[PDB]
Design an enzyme around this catalytic site. Structure first.
Site, PDB file in Angstrom:
ATOM      1  N   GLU A  19       0.894  -1.100   0.016  1.00 10.24           N
ATOM      2  CA  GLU A  19      -0.162  -0.187   0.029  1.00 10.24           C
ATOM      3  C   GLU A  19       1.009   1.215  -0.002  1.00 10.24           C
ATOM      4  O   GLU A  19       1.857   1.302   0.703  1.00 10.24           O
ATOM      5  CB  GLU A  19      -0.824  -0.030   1.101  1.00 10.24           C
ATOM      6  CG  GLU A  19      -1.609   1.143   1.376  1.00 10.24           C
ATOM      7  CD  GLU A  19      -2.721   1.475   0.172  1.00 10.24           C
ATOM      8  OE1 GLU A  19      -3.759   0.530  -0.067  1.00 10.24           O
ATOM      9  OE2 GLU A  19      -2.260   2.064  -0.886  1.00 10.24           O
ATOM     10  N   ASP A  76      -2.114  -5.131   1.060  1.00 10.46           N
ATOM     11  CA  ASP A  76      -1.389  -3.962   1.602  1.00 10.46           C
ATOM     12  C   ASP A  76      -0.301  -4.340   2.171  1.00 10.46           C
ATOM     13  O   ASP A  76       0.671  -3.170   2.099  1.00 10.46           O
ATOM     14  CB  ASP A  76      -2.559  -3.420   3.000  1.00 10.46           C
ATOM     15  CG  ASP A  76      -3.583  -3.039   2.421  1.00 10.46           C
ATOM     16  OD1 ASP A  76      -3.638  -2.053   1.599  1.00 10.46           O
ATOM     17  OD2 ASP A  76      -4.578  -3.275   3.236  1.00 10.46           O
ATOM     18  N   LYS A  88     -15.293  -7.998   2.523  1.00 14.42           N
ATOM     19  CA  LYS A  88     -13.830  -8.075   2.194  1.00 14.42           C
ATOM     20  C   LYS A  88     -13.624  -9.549   1.892  1.00 14.42           C
ATOM     21  O   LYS A  88     -12.667  -9.686   0.845  1.00 14.42           O
ATOM     22  CB  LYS A  88     -12.983  -7.572   3.191  1.00 14.42           C
ATOM     23  CG  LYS A  88     -11.416  -7.541   2.834  1.00 14.42           C
ATOM     24  CD  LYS A  88     -10.602  -6.774   3.574  1.00 14.42           C
ATOM     25  CE  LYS A  88     -10.807  -5.413   3.907  1.00 14.42           C
ATOM     26  NZ  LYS A  88     -10.304  -4.386   2.709  1.00 14.42           N
TER      27      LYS A  88
END
Ligand SMILES: COc1cc2c(cc1OC)CC(NC(=O)c1nc([C@@H]3CCCN3C(=O)CSc3ccccc3Cl)[nH]c(=O)c1O)C2
Ligand SMILES: [Mn+2]
Ligand SMILES: [Mn+2]
Length: 180
Positions: A65, A93, A119
């Protein structure tokens, strides 16, 4: 049309995180001056990801990320073609070199259960580890494996609750919670 939320975001998060969030929003055709709640949420997500990478050993985590879309996927393929881990369908991430898995960190204003469910089905990657943080102090991770020790996670939850208090003191919390 400068908003109160925009000026708060800038004196709450450090300039490097504000810089990365502006780039991430502009890359996908969004303006931090207008969609300001999303501006705050990406800054929050970025800071949590950075505190998270701080929690482990020196070289435990590879940060994905905060990179541009091309280089982030370049690092993902390097990690995959080196460790043999399955290539995720969507950008994670972090990568955990200790546990050998990708992590997608979630920061939500809803109940951790509801956000986690979405998610999981959305990522659809069986191997990508999921770690959810809420602004109320609750967390939830895949297989109840929280990766970090309790103190590193407690520091993240404290920061999350401080951010929420700061917006509430400026009457921007209600509009922010109603934005997710
Ligand atoms: C704009 O389309 C996409 C953008 C991106 C991805 C995929 C996208 O669709 C094709 C991968 C990557 N997203 C994440 O890394 C990520 N995203 C989220 C939440 C829920 C799922 C979508 N989302 C967004 O914020 C999308 S918008 C946005 C994202 C980043 C910067 C600026 C903006 Cl405006 N929550 C996280 O916890 C998290 O890690 C960037
Ligand atoms: Mn991400
Ligand atoms: Mn994430």
């Amino acid at each position: 049309r400068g908003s109160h939320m925009e000026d708060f975001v800038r004196q709450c998060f450090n300039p490097m995180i504000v810089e990365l969030a502006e780039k991430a929003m502009k890359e996908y055709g969004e303006d931090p001056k207008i969609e300001t709640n999303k501006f705050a949420a990406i800054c929050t997500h970025l800071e949590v990801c950075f505190m998270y990478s701080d929690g482990g050993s020196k070289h435990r985590f590879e940060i994905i990320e905060g990179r541009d879309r091309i280089m982030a996927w370049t690092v993902v393929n390097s990690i995959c073609n080196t460790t043999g881990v399955e290539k995720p369908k969507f950008l994670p991430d972090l990568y955990d070199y200790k546990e050998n898995r990708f992590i997608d960190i979630g920061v939500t204003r809803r109940e951790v259960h509801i956000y986690y469910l979405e998610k999981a089905n959305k990522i659809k990657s069986e191997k990508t580890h999921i770690h959810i943080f809420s602004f109320t102090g609750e967390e939830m991770a895949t297989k109840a494996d929280y990766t970090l020790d309790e103190e590193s996670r407690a520091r993240i939850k404290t920061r999350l609750f401080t951010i929420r208090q700061e917006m509430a003191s400026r009457s921007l919390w209600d509009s922010f919670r109603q934005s997710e």
